[PDB]
């Protein structure tokens, strides 16, 4: 018997900036149909790890495989098909319409079914009424939905195929409502299609609620890997977080809840 | 908004009307006027397209050839080739200066946090530097070379000939086509370097090729015209306010609108006053200035 | 010692950004303005602080209208802390805090600065370029500036206003500042009035809480009298519910799955 | 860092050494060189102090007199007073232009979100406008007035007399003292308008008085010297890198360092080449340019 899995594997990733190990020895794996969360305090290098798993930043000593093949040997097109990344800062200084911006996501696919993909994606991220609008004029949440739409459009295929969506740390003016909404959407997508989400959250509650596994990164090292309950306990929180945080139980769910002491 | 094909058609018949009408406005007509009108068209196209590629590459609404101080660098290299194939020495010289300052401004826009400020400040510094250097030399050494060069760096097409126009257009017309093939990368690069890298775009290649592209453009345009600084600022905004910022329709639209606007500015330069060939650049600086202050406000 | 506000209105082009709002902040009390975006919390803060003129209403401090208050004395009585720092020139932290001693004609600036900087944990920051400081360090230095402005050798009632926190400022520093001000409220005669976006911080560190929505005050009272599931659902869009704090006897606001 | 009193003393004996020393480099010494050296001192003090007040008011490391384009406005008002008590017509004219453009730049720095970019862009627009307008007129009308004015707006003290120096110094010396009395508000205004308002500072009054202050300064300095643009940028940074940004020590330190730097630049201007009086501004633009590009980088 064999249990084959679509796996993003990371073996001993190191990343130094001038002899300073920003990411020390880190090994992990994100599996298809799983919602993983990188957490940790400032300076831990979460963004650096994300950018290591995403193939953007070259590892120093370690390797980083995707579907059994090293990211080095992966070709730009196919990779662009398999893995997509959403950041929440928007750097558009020119009047692109929301449709143009999302359609820009269809880049790796030679114009094939761009209309279908855009229709579905924009339908499910709640745009459509935003389609013919200056991207710059959009409010924060609308930008959230449009960026989410861009990435989902890049990750649209007519077949059931394993793909990876990375979600960089949220911008700061973005309310709880929109973070929650996005994480819910991606959460259920994880159950439906073969999709692996890997997001970087600062909020411990959001990671507890919407992640299957959670990965506590501190000082470039992985100091915790497991369920929200295996990681988000009072001991480890006090250990790595400075705020006076404690762990209780969620009144409604069977998940840990992190609270502030008076 | 407006359909792209209509805007292109309108700008094209406008270009034709403007050329014929300015020719209107026999060795004179064949060997002076025709190639000066044509030089206004080709240079206007060069600055328009270059300003558009530039603005794209730096992700800046304000990235012009003669405002980042790339033009001034090219011109100063021309001067350094005169103090010490001739048109080719001007081409290669101005292209060296252009590519050099262009590479500086490119470096500074990428590695520092994206700020229009910083770039335009480097612009001010370089422009003030060269602008000072020229007048200084006007006070140091005296000959026809330096006066003619001082009036020439002001930006003028008073010296339009067929050989210059030929070499210039032989460098510019294929580079404007090469700018058009790159319009896809130029669109995806708008999202950000990393963002575009994720979509498959070879960001390094696109960055280099674009830098190069606009360097060749400005090199030629400057080494034949001098220093003009709004045909790369204003025309792309004008076309872009009536087409999507999509570079497939943006590039060519600018190329025709640049030829239009420079030609209107040159034809108006040699005509606005009784037998007085004032440099184009006085007119572009004059018109484009308080227009640009209006944009801010 | 009372800061009273009677029917404050503030319009921007006929649009009532702050509709009818009446309130009072008392000495030795830690009040919290909360609400969702657009409610005009900053506008209310800037109304109570005397910076923005009311339209129809009045705003008294110690029985005297803010209009008739003189700039010096007012600068002695009330201080305001914002968390955005707009320094483009190399002022040392000491210079920046000492700048807080403005209303006091050089009198006891050394003593005040010593105490204040001691209690906000600076001192090792005193001879440093203000621009180089990290986020939390900026928090402590700004807090120090305001406490320095509010230092007097006598037991006198004073008001400290605390504008909405910057966004890169962690929970640790918000919590720390609110704790410090909280206990100061018990020791000296000081009234704190802060504007928080976080409901838990307001629950924990406020005596009274003031829910501002659409320029109107829609709730005034204890964390328990206000932060209940009904009112939260009513005015906040996130799927928030109310439970009990495992450690304290205060309401706790949580996110539903 | 360095003690303020030592820095002031050093800059003062440096000023003396520079004045006397430039006096070796008979109605020449008494009625030409003495008041030209003294004019370099008084104008350098004007630009230094004005650039410092300006930088303070706009909370900008880059707010100079001839870079926001206040100088160019003053000069263009001088030109508008010549195309159509005489020194007073120049004073009042240049002060009108100065205060006008100064009030524009002040408005734009306050009401929009604080950005150095925007301000310096308005600078570029206005500078390009006036710089274009002058050369245009050089091509339009021809007389001694316009050539002398074109060379004069380049920034020069070649025309230093005792009456000009007297009026200029009678407007400048009390305004530099008035700048010194305001150094308290200038410090508190650094925190922000609201922040300062809370401390008791009448922010409106301080803003006006400062605006006014620097307007009078630049008005005089320009209407006697023309257009120089780094004696307000560089000297305050130079003093401030060796004293606290406290304005009590900042203002006077700049006032002495400006007189130092301008005088070194003017004395070097009329001497750097055999009987060639090149305008100071070519030298300031030249030296200050690539220095400023270095600051950015």
What is the SS3 string spanning B227-294? CCCCCCCHHHHHHHCCCCCCHHHHHHHHHHHHHHHHHHHHHCCCCCCCCCCCCHHHHHHHHHHHHHHH
Nearest CB to C246: which of A206, A246, A255? A246
What is the dihedral sign for C-alpha B92, B98, B102, B105?
A: positive
C-chain CB neighbours of D198 within 8 Å are: 49, 51, 75, 78-80, 149
Any chains having at least 3 CB pairs less than 8 A from chain C are A, D
Q: DSSP assignment, residue B3?
A: -
B70/B63 Cα distance (integer angstroms): 10
Question: What residues of chain B, 88 to 127, have a C-beta less than 8 Å from chain D?
Answer: 108, 115-118, 120-126
Asked if C246's CB is within 8 angstroms of A248's CB, the reply is yes
Q: Which structure tokens are listed for B7?
A: 């805007």
3-class DSSP state of B104: helix
Q: Which structure tokens are listed for C182?
A: 């909280």
- Residue pair D250/D52 in contact by the 8 Å Cβ criterion: yes
Nearest CB to B191: which of A54, A76, A104? A104
Nearest CB to B245: which of A87, A94, A107? A94
Q: Record the resolution, in angstroms.
A: 3.0
Bin D196: left if φ > 0, else alpha if -120 < ψ < 50, else beta.
alpha
With 0-12 / 13-18 / 19 or more C-beta atoms within 10 angstroms meaning exposed / middle / buried, residue A116 is exposed
How many other CB atoms are found less than 10 A from the CB of residue B14? Answer: 16
**Which of B116, B198, B243 is most worth mutating to test chain A (most A CB atoms within 10 A of its CB)?**
B198
- Residue pair A97/A133 in contact by the 8 Å Cβ criterion: yes
**Which of B104, B139, B233, B279 is most worth mutating to test chain D (most D CB atoms within 10 A of its CB)?**
B139
CB-facing half-sphere around the CA of B275: CA atoms within 13 A: 0
CA D189 from centre of chain: 21
CA D128 from centre of chain: 19
Chain C: residues touching D (Cβ < 8 Å): 46, 49, 51, 71-72, 74-75, 78-80, 82, 86-92, 95-96, 99-100, 102-103, 149
What is the SS3 string spanning chain C? CEEEEEEEEEEECCEEEEEEEEEEEECCCEEEEECCCCCCHHHHHHHHCCCCCCCCCEEEECCEECCCCCHHHHHHHEEEECCCCCCCCCCEHHHHHHHHHCCCCCCCHHHHHHHHHHHCCCCCCCCCEHHHCCHHHHHHHHHHHHHHHCCCCCCCCEEEEECCCCCCCCHHHHHHHHHHHHHHHHHCCEEEEEECCCHHHHHHHCCEEEEEECCEEEEEECHHHHCCHHHHHHHCCCCEEEEECCCCCCEEEEECC
Chain D: residues touching C (Cβ < 8 Å): 55, 59-61, 114, 187-188, 190-192, 194-195, 197-202, 240, 244-246
Rounded to the nearest angstrom, the minimum Cα separation between D55 and chain C is 9
Q: Which structure tokens are listed for A239?
A: 């250990």
Asked if B139's CB is within 8 angstroms of D278's CB, the reply is yes
C-chain CB neighbours of D248 within 8 Å are: none
Domains in chain B, number: 1
Closest CA in chain B for residue A155: B199
Closest CA in chain A for residue C182: A262
A129 contacts chain C (CB < 8 A): no
C247/C252 Cα distance (integer angstroms): 10
**Which of C183, C206, C254 is most worth mutating to test chain A (most A CB atoms within 10 A of its CB)?**
C254
A46/A40 Cα distance (integer angstroms): 7
Asked if B135's CB is within 8 angstroms of D289's CB, the reply is no
Enumerate residues 6+ apart whose C-beta is below 8 A from D26.
none
B224/B91 Cα distance (integer angstroms): 8
Nearest to C253 by CA among C201, C205, C215: C201
Q: Do chains B and D touch (3 or more CB pairs under 8 A)?
A: yes
Tell me the helix, strand and coil percentages in chain B, rounded to 5.
Answer: 75, 0, 25
B-chain CB neighbours of A100 within 8 Å are: 244-246
Q: DSSP assignment, residue D148?
A: H
- Residue pair C218/C34 in contact by the 8 Å Cβ criterion: no
C183/C198 Cα distance (integer angstroms): 20
A244 contacts chain C (CB < 8 A): yes
Termini Cα distance of chain D: 23
Q: How many CB pairs under 8 A join A and C?
A: 64
Alpha-carbon distance values, A135 to A121, A130, B180 (Å): 17, 9, 24
Q: DSSP assignment, residue A97?
A: B
D274 contacts chain B (CB < 8 A): no
Q: b/e for D223-232, b at 16 or more Cβ within 10 A?
A: bbbbbbbbbb
Tokens 């404050």 belong to residue = C8
Nearest to C177 by CA among C235, C138, C228: C138
- Beta strands A35-39 and A213-218, pairing class: parallel
Asked if D62's CB is within 8 angstroms of B129's CB, the reply is no
Q: Which structure tokens are listed for D225?
A: 């010297």
Domains delineated in chain C: 1-257 (3.40.50.300)
Annotated binding site of C for ATP: 35-42
How many other CB atoms are found less than 10 A from the CB of residue A93? Answer: 19
- Residue pair C47/C10 in contact by the 8 Å Cβ criterion: yes
Q: Do chains D and A touch (3 or more CB pairs under 8 A)?
A: no
Nearest to B239 by CA among B17, B16, B45, B41: B45
C185 contacts chain A (CB < 8 A): no
C186 contacts chain A (CB < 8 A): no
Enumerate residues 6+ apart whose C-beta is below 8 A from A46.
A38, A39, A40, A169, A200, A217
With 0-12 / 13-18 / 19 or more C-beta atoms within 10 angstroms meaning exposed / middle / buried, residue D91 is buried
Phi, psi (deg, nearest 5) at residue A219: 50, 45
3-class DSSP state of B187: helix
Annotated binding site of A: 40-47
B-chain CB neighbours of D139 within 8 Å are: 273, 276, 278, 282
What is the domain range of residue D267? Answer: 1-297
How many other CB atoms are found less than 10 A from the CB of residue A238? Answer: 14
Nearest to C179 by CA among A244, D108, A26: A244
B76 contacts chain D (CB < 8 A): no
- State the structure-solving technique: X-ray
Q: DSSP assignment, residue D28?
A: T
C51/C100 Cα distance (integer angstroms): 18
**Which H or E element spans position A217?**
strand A213-218
Asked if B199's CB is within 8 angstroms of A105's CB, the reply is yes
D56/D207 Cα distance (integer angstroms): 10
Nearest to A154 by CA among B187, B183, B246, B199: B199
D132 contacts chain B (CB < 8 A): yes
**Which of C77, C91, C102, C126 is most worth mutating to test chain D (most D CB atoms within 10 A of its CB)?**
C102
Asked if D296's CB is within 8 angstroms of B108's CB, the reply is yes
Q: At D56, which CATH number? A: 1.10.3470.10
Rounded to the nearest angstrom, the minimum Cα separation between D141 and chain B is 11
């Amino acid at each position: 018997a064999v249990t084959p899995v679509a796996l993003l594997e990371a073996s001993h990733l190191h990343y130094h900036v001038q002899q300073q190990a920003l990411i020390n020895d880190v090994s992990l794996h994100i599996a298809s149909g799983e919602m993983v969360a990188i957490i940790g305090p400032n300076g831990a290098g979460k963004s650096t790890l994300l950018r290591l798993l995403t193939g953007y930043l070259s590892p120093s000593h370690g390797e980083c495989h995707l579907l059994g093949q090293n990211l080095n040997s992966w070709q730009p097109k196919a990779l662009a098909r398999t893995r997509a990344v959403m950041r929440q800062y928007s750097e558009l200084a020119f009047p692109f319409s929301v449709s143009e911006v999302i359609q820009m996501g269809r880049a790796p696919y030679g114009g094939s079914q761009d209309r279908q993909a855009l229709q579905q994606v924009m339908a499910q991220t709640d745009c459509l009424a935003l389609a013919q609008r200056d991207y710059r004029v959009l409010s924060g949440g609308e930008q959230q939905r449009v960026q989410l739409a861009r990435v989902l459009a890049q990750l649209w295929q007519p077949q059931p195929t394993p793909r990876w969506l990375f979600l960089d740390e949220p911008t700061s003016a973005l309310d709880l409502y929109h973070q929650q909404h996005t994480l819910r959407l991606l959460r259920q997508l994880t159950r439906q299609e073969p999709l692996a989400v890997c997001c970087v959250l600062h909020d411990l509650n959001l990671a507890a609620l919407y992640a299957d596994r959670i990965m506590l990164l501190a000082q470039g090292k992985l100091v915790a890997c497991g369920t929200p309950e295996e990681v988000l306990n009072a001991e480890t929180l006090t250990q790595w977080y400075q705020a006076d945080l404690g762990v209780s139980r969620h009144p409604e769910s069977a998940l840990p809840q992190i609270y502030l002491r008076q | 908004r407006v359909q792209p094909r209509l805007m292109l058609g309108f700008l094209l018949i406008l270009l034709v009307i403007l050329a014929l009408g300015s020719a209107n406005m026999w060795h004179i007509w064949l060997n002076i006027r025709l190639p000066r009108v044509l030089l206004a068209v080709v240079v206007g196209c060069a600055l328009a397209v270059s300003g558009t590629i530039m603005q794209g590459l730096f992700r800046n609404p304000l990235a012009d050839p003669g405002l980042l101080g790339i033009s001034s660098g090219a011109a100063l290299c021309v001067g350094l080739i005169i103090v010490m194939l001739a048109l080719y020495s001007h081409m290669v010289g101005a292209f060296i200066g252009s590519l050099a300052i262009s590479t500086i401004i490119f470096t500074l826009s990428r590695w520092g946090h994206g700020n229009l400020a910083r770039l335009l400040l480097a612009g001010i510094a370089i422009n003030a530097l060269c602008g000072a250097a020229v007048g200084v030399l006007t006070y140091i050494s005296d000959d026809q070379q330096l006066r003619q060069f001082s009036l020439w760096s002001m930006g003028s097409l008073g010296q339009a000939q067929w050989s210059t126009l030929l070499v210039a257009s032989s460098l510019i017309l294929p580079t404007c086509i090469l700018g058009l093939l790159q319009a896809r990368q130029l669109n995806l690069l708008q999202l950000g370097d990393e963002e575009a890298h994720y979509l498959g775009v070879n960001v390094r290649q696109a960055k280099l090729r674009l830098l190069l592209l606009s360097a060749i453009l400005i090199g030629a345009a400057v080494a034949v015209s001098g220093v003009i600084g709004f045909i790369g600022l204003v025309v792309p905004h004008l076309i872009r306010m009536r087409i999507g910022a999509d570079h497939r329709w943006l590039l060519p639209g600018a190329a025709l609108g640049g030829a239009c606007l420079l030609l209107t500015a040159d034809t108006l330069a040699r005509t606005l006053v009784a037998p007085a060939e004032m440099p184009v650049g006085l007119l572009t600086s004059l018109l484009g200035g308080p227009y640009f202050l209006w944009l801010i406000l």
